[PDB]
Amino acid sequence: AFCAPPAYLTHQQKVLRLYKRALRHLESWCIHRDKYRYFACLMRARFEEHKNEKDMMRATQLLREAEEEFWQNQHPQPYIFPDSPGGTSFERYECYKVPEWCLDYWHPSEKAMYPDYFSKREQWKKLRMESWDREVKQLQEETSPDGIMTEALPPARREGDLPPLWWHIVTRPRERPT
Amino acid sequence: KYKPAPLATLPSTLDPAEYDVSPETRRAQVERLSIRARLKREYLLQYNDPKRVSHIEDPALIRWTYARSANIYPNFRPTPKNSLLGAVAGFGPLIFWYYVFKTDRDRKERLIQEGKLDRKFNISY
Amino acid sequence: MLKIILPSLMLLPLTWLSSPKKTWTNVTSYSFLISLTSLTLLWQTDENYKNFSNMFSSDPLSTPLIILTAWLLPLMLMASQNHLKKDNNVLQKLYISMLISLQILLIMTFSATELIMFYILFEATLIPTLIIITRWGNQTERLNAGIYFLFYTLIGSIPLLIALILIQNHVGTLNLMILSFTTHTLDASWSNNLLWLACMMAFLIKMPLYGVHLWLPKAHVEAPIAGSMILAAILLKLGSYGMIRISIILDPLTKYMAYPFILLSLWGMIMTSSICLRQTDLKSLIAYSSVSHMALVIASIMIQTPWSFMGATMLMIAHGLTSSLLFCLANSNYERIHSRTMIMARGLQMVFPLMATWWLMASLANLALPPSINLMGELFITMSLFSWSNFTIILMGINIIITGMYSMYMIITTQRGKLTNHMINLQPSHTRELTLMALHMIPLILLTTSPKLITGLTM
Amino acid sequence: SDAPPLTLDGIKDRVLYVLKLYDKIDPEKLSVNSHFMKDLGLDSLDQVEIIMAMEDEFGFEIPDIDAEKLMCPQEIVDYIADKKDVYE
Amino acid sequence: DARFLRLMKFYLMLTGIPVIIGITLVNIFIGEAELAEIPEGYIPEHWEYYKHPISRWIARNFY
Amino acid sequence: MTKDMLPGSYPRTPEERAAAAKKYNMRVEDYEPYPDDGMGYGDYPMLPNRSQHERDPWYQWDHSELRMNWGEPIHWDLDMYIRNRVDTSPTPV
Amino acid sequence: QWQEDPEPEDENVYAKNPDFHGYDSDPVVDVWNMRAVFFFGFSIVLVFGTTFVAYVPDYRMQEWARREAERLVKYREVNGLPIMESNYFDPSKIQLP
Amino acid sequence: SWDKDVYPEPPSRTPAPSPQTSLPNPITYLTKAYDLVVDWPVTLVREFIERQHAKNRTYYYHRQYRRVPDITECKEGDVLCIYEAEMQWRRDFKVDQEIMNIIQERLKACQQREGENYQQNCAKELEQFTKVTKAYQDRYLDLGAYYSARKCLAKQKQRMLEERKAA
Amino acid sequence: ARQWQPDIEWAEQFSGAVMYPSKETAHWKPPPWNDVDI
Amino acid sequence: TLFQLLREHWVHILVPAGFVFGCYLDRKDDEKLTAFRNKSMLFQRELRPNEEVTWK
Amino acid sequence: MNIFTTSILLIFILLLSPILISMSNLIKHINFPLYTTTSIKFSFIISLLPLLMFFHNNMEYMITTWHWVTMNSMELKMSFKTDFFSILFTSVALFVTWSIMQFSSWYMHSDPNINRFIKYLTLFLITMLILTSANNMFQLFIGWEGVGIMSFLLIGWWYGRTDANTAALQAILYNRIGDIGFILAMVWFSLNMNSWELQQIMFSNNNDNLIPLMGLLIAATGKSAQFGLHPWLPSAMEGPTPVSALLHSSTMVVAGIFLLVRFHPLTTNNNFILTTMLCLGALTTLFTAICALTQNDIKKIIAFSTSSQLGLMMVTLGMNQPHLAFLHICTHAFFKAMLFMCSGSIIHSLADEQDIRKMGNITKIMPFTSSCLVIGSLALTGMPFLTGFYSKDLIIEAINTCNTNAWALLITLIATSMTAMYSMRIIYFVTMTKPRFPPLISINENDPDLMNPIKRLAFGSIFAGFVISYNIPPTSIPVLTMPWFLKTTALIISVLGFLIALELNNLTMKLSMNKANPYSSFSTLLGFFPSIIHRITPMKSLNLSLKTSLTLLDLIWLEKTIPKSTSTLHTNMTTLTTNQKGLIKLYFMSFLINIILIIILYSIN
């Protein structure tokens, strides 16, 4: 989530994605933890063929065979988490998630109801308006002129400056508010 | 195996076209990441500009709204398949429910005028 | 009647002779007093219909329409205020003058002893609505929408003039109670069938059903809020008062000429409810919703049950208040985001708690709540059409399924959701807009409380 | 809820407490700033198995696009802290 | 929102408290008329055909 | 916006097909429009008919309920394929 | 390029003045416009009109029709007539063809 | 108010309680306490209200309508006689509808006071109801939305021509 | 934000000699405003 | 008594003045349609001696 | 007579009181959860009075308070028929809502919108008790769609969850098809009997009421989650737990039964609709007892439990013991809301962990919640002389003794054996085995705000089935003479289902290979009805909406036929008219031709 997906998933990334889907659809199937640990080391007795495969056509063929085995023996209802998508509480607490532009539209009675926090938010907005004119100049010189541009944003190369594109990351609401 | 469907599609991890890929397909994926990076950097620059006070004017959403609203009749060509299927879908159930309504009301008017149908407690018609 | 007509005519020097700072407050306060003095028509202690003069008459079906005109004038003049906060003074006073003149001639059209006076003030609506739509519309297609509105209604209304002058030169005076009481049955003749089509085609265009429904969504997405509220809430149903008042001439021919218009009505309401499931523009979705809710009363006055006429009149005032509230909410969302796409503005309940409650009440009166007048009118129309034919209830059942689906689709799209956070300009809801939807909804709650006023012409 | 909020030292002690319970980890070798590939010498399965340990330890889901990148206890502590949004 | 709710309840309550007080006070103190037969030689006036005294007052004083 | 960036007509030539691809911010070789059946689609690009449940959930999106990006071409059936409406996610069986 | 003024930005009226009620941007005119439409629209029209509507007597002749129905059913059950005849108009009064 | 000629209710025939058990029933104790707490200030408030009504007591009269010549005696073309007969027929139509409401209220009250065994003592009320629905279906059935004295006269002339053809 | 007003491409479609062109009306010159032909 | 206040508050006269003129012209129209007065058979009554007109 | 009326309108006034408080500015000043549970506690204390006097004297009342509006011959008098159904269900519903408000005051403590939550629940109980005390069927529609509207407003409580909005649209859709069937039966009844209330509509037993009984069947499938319209109820487990515990366990879902329990005298004389409702409730009982055989979310398992019990109430309603069906409602509500509240206690103690494969050892972690879960699940199973036995044993006796179908016999006995199996699934995978929760164990059930309403529902579930089945007079015919292999067969298949599910579920403790057979795919994946129906009905519906109704008819062809065909015709007429070359020779030749035309017209005239 906080990092970025690539253009293509590699063979190691697809193999570890199959390992992750296998070791959660196992414990979706084998409910007790004794059966989960015995079948997980049986899954290690299944990974040991894929260790030193050198052709990579046969490794992609074994990847297709293991993926077909995973889709044949997968759980119809997999193991899901409260914080995962498709879950019990996927974006349940969106009643809290009202962002920081909506505090500008408060009445001055409610602004005087919170004295110090709005002064510190004025300090954060002053930090925004004194950081943006050097943040947007940093991206136009660290942007490569070649035809390939990645998704990951550059850090603060200049000392004393903030990283570029920081506000939408730093002012998300909290995932577990209350 | 798992048979595909138009409503239950093949996933991209089980897709056979993900496993036999070419460097031109990989170059297409790199160019798709490059155009998504250009659009994401333009959107994020317009997101985190503090001089902006209005909303984000989404050009592709304006394009989709214009295509669903005011492009269909400028992009009409009258074909016999469109004409026959539109004539069936705009005329056919009117004659069908005409036959249903006229058959049921001819039955009801015939049974009322012959006296077989009785309105026993029917005050508010 | 003249205590309602003539001070509304004296609202014109109130607009043009006051200060530009004070036009809105004087015209809105005195138009609310116009509605207070237009509550005087409810003094029916007998079934003798109130005839104040030989010019104007009061009818029990026409009186909730006449309070809806005099009540709809300050609800339009509230909603035009931040719409016209940047325009200058003489265009602002011209907008207020065209709105007031539309109110004057709508009051005078609903108070009609004579049907050619009804036709004069029925086609007198076609100028100021076109002035509102094709000058103050905010998009490109308002010229095409004004041409569509003007020529759909004039190509309907020209054979209405033909059949009215032919009926007048046949039988004598076009006074409504004179031609109610002295008239005779019409023979089954093909010239009388063309007379039926000629006198009905104007109202069959003005209430949108298929073939001729298409001027309404163009002249609702290219209208302003006052033009959209007048065209969705009383001026569309001016032709429905005409479709009620014409049919007493010619009741023996309706029982075999009724069937294609009920057919086109019912399949048009299924297909327009199906249209509203996939729509980008929210104002177009409420427009095709008005097309479906007008196809219901097209079927209801194409049948001549008295039960149908009560369900018809209940659907008139329920659809007018509900569609006016929904179009005002669409104008509020258009005011916040400067667009009318439902997809681009979601999750608005997180920043607007009470506008979510008015959105809930408007679309949950569009979805027909049971003590509300929407399911009261639709249930009485369902009773009458099941008396007409026993196989018709599956069509209106499919319509009520898809009207629940488009109403809660509009709630779940534009109110619930993730809260799109790319909008700084979601300013909080005005006291104007909140009291505007309060003065929309609180008459519907009081009309739910007392439904004796809304029973129409026939019980 | 009734769950207590999570401190940084408590999150670090929990992550180190699960990480010393793995079989191929020497607990005297294990520090908070040690890389899984070149400083404790682990394989490609063991990093995502540390990720499953954090999955059934903290009750939330780490995506695999972050979980491939996570390689050391200090930024797995900082990533879990920045996902649960704790102030210290 | 709370400004609108306070102003709506205040400027509805400003008329709605003495109107409801007047309705309750006229129903306690004056009250409805009972029905009776028409006396011989006396026609009724046009306010005398209604049973609530507010309706009798507005019938005798406005219509 | 203007008439050039607004949609119109059908791509009959490959240079106007490339111009429509740079209109819609899509790739030139991926620009497969709808077939010219006179249905009013025109130069709108045919995406594959996969709903928004099938996209990547954990990646942060520009339009979060839509799971779309800003300037990515919105599907003609996006209101059909929204997360409240019908999913085309892969079933287990 | 043709000579056109650019798009005017929607400035925040709540940042301009805090007591913005949706009316014209002069705040005294805005506040008195709110007081005028609330006192003249919500106060003396909804409540007084609901009072006038609730104290309209015998609307669509329903209360008199109920009392005359009670008197008529009482008279027909006293004198022994059936409670409704089948024909309204009198067949002695009618002239058949 | 309540008048037994138009609303005939049979009087209550509730049995004596006679409790065999030594445990007293809580309903009669709680309703004596309910009467002594609630019903006595309510009837004192009603006694004050009836005292003020008897002090400011007025009378209102039931409106009586003189019978005009009907549409069988009035002339077609003569609009004024047609309107007087039409409003006489509309007043009789309104009182016919509320007479049907009276028989419907009688049927509902008789079915509720007879309960599950409703047929043996609702046979006379159902006979009265089927007579008045046969009379109303002979009178104002299928008249249209614009029901008139002329249209009811046309329906009655159609039925009398049918009965003349049958006889 | 603003309402739509006609542009050059909307004003120039009324600027011909005729509104709806044909195969024979395409050669029609716009007439001079002083009604004098050189 | 200020001229600016009188000039900006003379406009409040007109709609009450329109109400008074509308009620006056309606009562003037009431005098025209009196050819049927105490002659309809529903309300044909003997006139009481305190009045010369049965409805006004 | 006087006290019997004002107690039921005092119940309605005390339910209207927290809505009346919440409009004003007192809502920021009083303790509104404690105020609402005190109001519903005093409403239940008031509601025990008509319960006790109906248990004494057995008087059924018809209360028309407000004569609303009169149309032609139909009056719409607001009316409150209180009887064996309405008095008992208002008392049981007020007791269980007292339990739900006292549970929700602890469970919704993190949510700061608990005033709006409890206002929505109080408005839901206003609509459910006006469904309960409806004589006139316009009030029955007022209840019948006010509960669906408050179901929407309580199921879309977390507004940002798109799957919860999908469940909101599913609940609104299937309640709307139930509204279509209720509109059908209602419109036929108002046409051909000229009323809407029970005091005249009971006279239509001598007529042919097959089309309104089909409409009541469609409304019962709409509100009771049967095999046309079941998937709104297992998808309803994505909202809050007092929402799904009062709404989607106890009071909302039994309204589809309650319509025909109210309509006992019209159901009896028709024999085809009895067999139709018997077969369809039996198919519902099999499908929602075979869905929870391997189901996984705990609220989804108890949702299939209440759907199987709702199908068994439809089995007895089509078997024509609707008083026994209502006895199953008034005994079912206590243990099923206890099982929902116990599942929510585990949810708030284990931080919203809904899958049963990461929770366990609850009988040593939370002993109060496990003891209340075993009395609720044991009353669901049908151990003797609990609240569930005093209905469900008589249900199985009526099933064995009446003229039901043989496949309905086999399928309902198999589905109640499966009811014992899914109860064994909850006991084995929640209360039993070695634990599986996340290792931070924060356990908080020492609040008396949590402890007391589960005690109140447990005392109701231990002392209510006996007190209702003993206080209620003999209102049907119970026959007790059956063979002893057919008399104790409910206990025989309950202990047989317990032993079969024990020997099935003890195999997963053993170290063996799990098989993904299509029987477990059918059980786990909800019988494929939401996948197949909820994709093939919106794809065909919205594809016909786009490619037929929006684009093809309205946008392109009605526009091509009515406006633009005349526009194209007049454009072609103007281009063929005003295309002259400006020569006066061509003008004068046309003048000569029309002069010859005038001469020819005169010569023929």
Short mmCIF file of N, CA and C in Angstrom, two decimals, chain G residues 36-74:
data_model
loop_
_atom_site.label_atom_id
_atom_site.label_comp_id
_atom_site.label_asym_id
_atom_site.label_seq_id
_atom_site.Cartn_x
_atom_site.Cartn_y
_atom_site.Cartn_z
N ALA G 36 -36.43 37.50 7.78
CA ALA G 36 -37.65 37.82 7.05
C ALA G 36 -38.27 36.59 6.41
N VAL G 37 -37.47 35.71 5.79
CA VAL G 37 -38.07 34.52 5.20
C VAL G 37 -38.42 33.47 6.25
N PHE G 38 -37.81 33.51 7.44
CA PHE G 38 -38.21 32.58 8.49
C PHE G 38 -39.47 33.05 9.20
N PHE G 39 -39.59 34.35 9.48
CA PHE G 39 -40.79 34.85 10.15
C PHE G 39 -41.96 34.96 9.19
N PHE G 40 -41.71 35.32 7.94
CA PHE G 40 -42.79 35.45 6.98
C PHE G 40 -43.08 34.16 6.22
N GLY G 41 -42.18 33.17 6.26
CA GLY G 41 -42.46 31.93 5.55
C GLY G 41 -42.70 30.69 6.39
N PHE G 42 -41.91 30.52 7.45
CA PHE G 42 -42.00 29.34 8.29
C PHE G 42 -42.92 29.55 9.47
N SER G 43 -43.07 30.80 9.91
CA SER G 43 -43.78 31.10 11.15
C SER G 43 -45.25 31.41 10.90
N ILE G 44 -45.54 32.41 10.07
CA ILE G 44 -46.90 32.91 9.93
C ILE G 44 -47.63 32.34 8.73
N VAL G 45 -47.02 31.40 8.00
CA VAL G 45 -47.66 30.77 6.84
C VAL G 45 -47.85 29.28 7.05
N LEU G 46 -46.83 28.58 7.55
CA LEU G 46 -46.98 27.15 7.82
C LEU G 46 -47.85 26.89 9.04
N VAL G 47 -47.63 27.61 10.14
CA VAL G 47 -48.35 27.33 11.38
C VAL G 47 -49.76 27.91 11.33
N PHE G 48 -49.89 29.16 10.88
CA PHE G 48 -51.20 29.80 10.72
C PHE G 48 -52.02 29.14 9.62
N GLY G 49 -51.36 28.71 8.54
CA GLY G 49 -52.06 28.00 7.49
C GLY G 49 -52.46 26.60 7.87
N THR G 50 -51.65 25.92 8.70
CA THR G 50 -52.04 24.63 9.26
C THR G 50 -53.21 24.77 10.24
N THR G 51 -53.24 25.89 10.99
CA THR G 51 -54.37 26.20 11.86
C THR G 51 -55.65 26.47 11.06
N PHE G 52 -55.54 27.23 9.97
CA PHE G 52 -56.68 27.52 9.10
C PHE G 52 -57.16 26.28 8.35
N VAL G 53 -56.23 25.42 7.94
CA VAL G 53 -56.56 24.16 7.27
C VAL G 53 -57.24 23.19 8.24
N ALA G 54 -56.73 23.09 9.47
CA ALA G 54 -57.31 22.20 10.47
C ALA G 54 -58.63 22.73 11.03
N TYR G 55 -58.90 24.03 10.89
CA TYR G 55 -60.19 24.56 11.31
C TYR G 55 -61.04 25.06 10.15
N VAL G 56 -60.77 24.59 8.94
CA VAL G 56 -61.82 24.60 7.92
C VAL G 56 -62.90 23.60 8.34
N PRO G 57 -64.17 24.01 8.41
CA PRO G 57 -65.22 23.06 8.79
C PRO G 57 -65.91 22.40 7.61
N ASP G 58 -66.16 21.09 7.78
CA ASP G 58 -66.92 20.21 6.88
C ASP G 58 -66.35 20.19 5.46
N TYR G 59 -65.05 19.89 5.36
CA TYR G 59 -64.37 19.96 4.07
C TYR G 59 -64.79 18.78 3.21
N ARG G 60 -65.23 19.10 1.98
CA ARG G 60 -65.89 18.20 1.02
C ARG G 60 -67.13 17.53 1.61
N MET G 61 -67.85 18.27 2.48
CA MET G 61 -69.17 17.95 3.04
C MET G 61 -69.20 16.65 3.85
N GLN G 62 -68.05 16.26 4.43
CA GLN G 62 -67.91 14.94 5.02
C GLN G 62 -68.59 14.83 6.38
N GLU G 63 -68.49 15.88 7.21
CA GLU G 63 -69.08 15.83 8.54
C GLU G 63 -70.60 15.96 8.49
N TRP G 64 -71.11 16.85 7.62
CA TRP G 64 -72.55 16.93 7.39
C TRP G 64 -73.08 15.67 6.72
N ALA G 65 -72.30 15.06 5.83
CA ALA G 65 -72.73 13.84 5.18
C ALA G 65 -72.76 12.66 6.15
N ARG G 66 -71.86 12.64 7.14
CA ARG G 66 -71.91 11.62 8.18
C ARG G 66 -73.10 11.83 9.12
N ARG G 67 -73.40 13.09 9.49
CA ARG G 67 -74.56 13.37 10.34
C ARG G 67 -75.89 13.12 9.61
N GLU G 68 -75.96 13.45 8.32
CA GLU G 68 -77.16 13.19 7.54
C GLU G 68 -77.30 11.71 7.22
N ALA G 69 -76.18 10.97 7.14
CA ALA G 69 -76.25 9.52 7.00
C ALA G 69 -76.74 8.85 8.27
N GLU G 70 -76.33 9.38 9.44
CA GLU G 70 -76.84 8.87 10.71
C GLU G 70 -78.33 9.16 10.88
N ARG G 71 -78.76 10.38 10.50
CA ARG G 71 -80.17 10.75 10.54
C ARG G 71 -81.00 9.95 9.54
N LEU G 72 -80.44 9.68 8.36
CA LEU G 72 -81.18 8.95 7.34
C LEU G 72 -81.28 7.46 7.66
N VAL G 73 -80.22 6.86 8.20
CA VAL G 73 -80.27 5.45 8.61
C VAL G 73 -81.19 5.27 9.81
N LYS G 74 -81.20 6.25 10.74
CA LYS G 74 -82.13 6.25 11.87
C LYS G 74 -83.59 6.40 11.42
#
